[PDB]
């Protein structure tokens, strides 16, 4: 309630944020005092008369120090390895042997999983750590299938692009390039499964939950780009099948190169030199090239479950979340200089050394590649005399190259302020609040009670510790007041 | 104020370029007595207003107009600094940018000497 | 590795018709994406000879995303490096350097009635205990005097 | 007066700047203590017998913490929206709809 009033008031902003820290530190100071395991398992989930209810409620409210405390981390660790229990302290080599064995034996697991009530290995496979290793192994085999599909071209293509080659003269050429191979079928089976899982999650979570997380939308967009590329490939396959069914019926010749064809069916004999600039094949290759680059961003689901690459990712996410405020300001200066450079050089399309600045797309291109030191000075020079125009061009291009460096400098220095603000004992805490969230993705699927006695004992210990610290915070004043009251009795008696 | 003055100077140069072409048109429409302006050659002062951009004099009012008008459009997007402080997200950004730009010039004067 | 696999899958069919020989095999795509981080690469590896402008625009877009991503990663590296200097603080570089050189020196050095040693060690431990008790007593001066004058006021109440 | 003597002396530079901080912190510490709205509207403009006279005089002298205090910011915000009063807490989408309607 306090953390939501802080975003609505905005003038008493610091006061509600000062009160929320007291509301969190009360809970952390209560958590400290627990000694037996019954008190920890009475705090972390509520009155029962697993199911980690208070921990799942402290994820939503983002109380980072309640989850990053050791008395909660050991209770989560005894669930994360709940049947292995010897792997809890082993080297990374033994852990890599495990993921290699499971990644090898992935297709044996369903056969071992319908057995699972009759098997001790069935219960030893239904642990959170084995579910995590199984999902990671499946996603690694996916990338392996993509790279192996890309194979047989690793050292060049073997022919030239304008030359055609077929198995037999009768076969039309356009069939052989667009037909499917066995690995693309497995890609088609795999994409549909990930689309199905995201379809189930969206229906239950709702649009607001999908919209709230930027990462969910990135995943869903990657799946949609895959589906669009394969639909374009199938539309390219159907027309070649139609042309083959035409030719094999009405050919009445020895070879398809002998007698010329009607000109619509003639188009499916050409090589890549003469394809129409909107071919379904070309659209398929472009979208399929985008999707493979987007499909290696899924390793961010894997990386927080590791100590060495853990706090790295969090700082990378913070800097990427802090770039965009600078990026919006950089777009304005970029747009100003590109509109000015376009208005200047637009009448000189015929007479320039370079083709730069003569249209909006090309001016965008030159001003974008000029910030990476991959541009020429000789885009500014022209062929006629008109030296006033050329000097104004040099001056504006120099002002642009200075302004981008200044903006860049400002960005770096503002980034330093965040590190000073971070201080100490937070990266360790922030990283812990990452990994536990990941772990909680897999856990799923009169006479007073005992609970109230335990809670009464905890609150009594908290009150006693607070009074002891308050008494030892000021020692001399009570003794001076007592000896003043004793001097009062000494004055009364004497 | 300088941005406004550069705009005014560019449009005055454009108007000076327009007046002489009106004078040449009033000459030709009076004393032409032909079917087309490409048929009979003209006196050589009026002949100059038939050329394309390959043969213009290197101080033409048109060229001066295009140059100053290209400077003024770049300067006229710096007016968004009147808008940006009335926003929480882009607010403290601008202030740090103004501080760094105010602190560059002391280094710039020392860099000019070595250059 | 992500960007080199994507750039190889895109331009692999155009080996015969390009301006530059880049991206047409895995070794050459590795070469171009490695030398592009040192500003020693061309834009004209992306352009090709045919029309197929969809392919060329996807090439420009992916190459621009790569050149932005490397700078962001580089920026993150530099800022994380600063955290270590703040963590280092003071009176440690001098100490760390000394622990270097002494290690180097130790590479060359090679090739009833109690003893005297126990008397020396007993004297040292006695001095440590005495210094610790003096510092603990001077850590809180007023409380002992207040307790003493309270106990004296107890005797003054007993006598009066 | 102290902040102008600091630029004329330049050898006792730090002393006049140390005194100007006391002259500013007195005003901020007085501003803190006001409880009712009549005390805030008695400090922010002077004796009348809007017209934000002390705030317009604290812009000239650059006393940043007297203007950046919340008890002044709420009085300025109740003038900045003085007839709208429902737009004071809305999303940025509703604000962009307003500027699009007015720009049309
Ligand atoms: C370096 C990339 C690997 C990503 C995952 C990772 O770092 O985790 C390492 C371990 C899992 O960690 P643990 O739970 O055993 O704890 C590590 C203790 N510091 O095992 C894994 O989770 C690895 C699964 C990958 C096998 C295909
Ligand atoms: C991103 C560039 C916009 C510049 C102005 C700006 O950020 O202000 C946003 C609001 C004005 O802000 P408010 O007074 O409503 O307060 C914002 C509360 N954080 O509305 C405006 O002032 C915008 C006016 C522009 C419409 C043409
Ligand atoms: C001042 C007059 C310059 C004369 C124009 C000429 O022939 O080249 C000089 C021009 C091009 O390099 O200089 C610049 O790059 C300007 C940089 C300004 C930095 C804020
Ligand atoms: C957006 C559409 C671009 C059109 C493609 C074209 O012809 O060139 C533009 C392309 C190449 O420079 O732009 C880039 O470099 C993209 C950088 C994106 C930064 C995240
Ligand atoms: C294909 O292109 C090459 C390019 O050098 C050319 O030599 C060859 O003649 C072309 N073949 C056809 C059939 O056009």
Author numbering:
A (entry chain A): 232 to 280, 292 to 687, 758 to 806
B (entry chain B): 462 to 576
C (entry chain D): 577 to 687, 758 to 806
D (entry chain B): 232 to 280, 292 to 346
Which lines from the publication concern this structure?
A key component of SOCE has been identified as the TRPC channels, which are calcium-permeable, nonselective cation channels belonging to the TRP superfamily. Among the seven members in TRPC family, TRPC3, TRPC6, and TRPC7 are the closest homologues, and they are unique in being activated by the lipid secondary messenger diacylglycerol (DAG), a degradation product of the signaling lipid phosphatidylinositol 4,5-bisphosphate (PIP2). TPRC3, TRPC6, and TRPC7 share several functional domains, including N-terminal ankyrin repeats (AR), a transmembrane domain (TMD) with six transmembrane helixes (S1-S6), and a C-terminal coiled-coil domain (CTD). TRPC3 is abundantly expressed in the cerebellum, cerebrum, and smooth muscles, and it plays essential roles in the regulation of neurogenesis and extracellular/intracellular calcium signaling.
Here, we report the structure of full-length human TRPC3 (hTRPC3) in a lipid-occupied, inactive state at an atomic resolution of 3.3 Å using single-particle cryo-electron microscopy (cryo-EM). Detailed inspection of the TMD in TRPC3 reveals two unique features: a large elbow-like pre-S1 domain harboring a lipid-binding site (lipid 1), and an unusually long S3 helix forming an extracellular domain (ECD), along with the S1-S2 linker and S3-S4 linker. We identified two lipid-like densities, one sandwiched between the pre-S1 elbow and the S4-S5 linker, and the other wedged between the P loop and S6 of the adjacent subunit. The head group of lipid 1 is well defined in the density map, forming several hydrogen bonds and polar interactions with residues in the LD9, the pre-S1 elbow, half TM1, and the S4-S5 linker, while the two hydrocarbon tails are in contact with S1, S4, the pre-S1 elbow, and half TM1. We also identified a second lipid-like density (lipid 2) in the lateral fenestration of the pore domain, wedged between the P loop and S6 of adjacent subunit and forming both hydrophobic and hydrophilic interactions. Furthermore, a glycosylation site (N404) is observed in the S1-S2 loop, consistent with the prediction that TRPC3 is monoglycosylated in the extracellular side. The TRP helix forms an approximate right angle to the S6, in strong contrast to the TRPV1, TRPA1, and TRPM4 structures whose TRP helices form obtuse angles with S6. The pore adopts a closed conformation with the narrowest radius - at I658 and L654 on S6 close to the intracellular exit − of less than 1 Å, thus preventing ion passage. The selectivity filter is defined by the backbone carbonyl oxygens of I613, F614 and G615 located in the P loop.
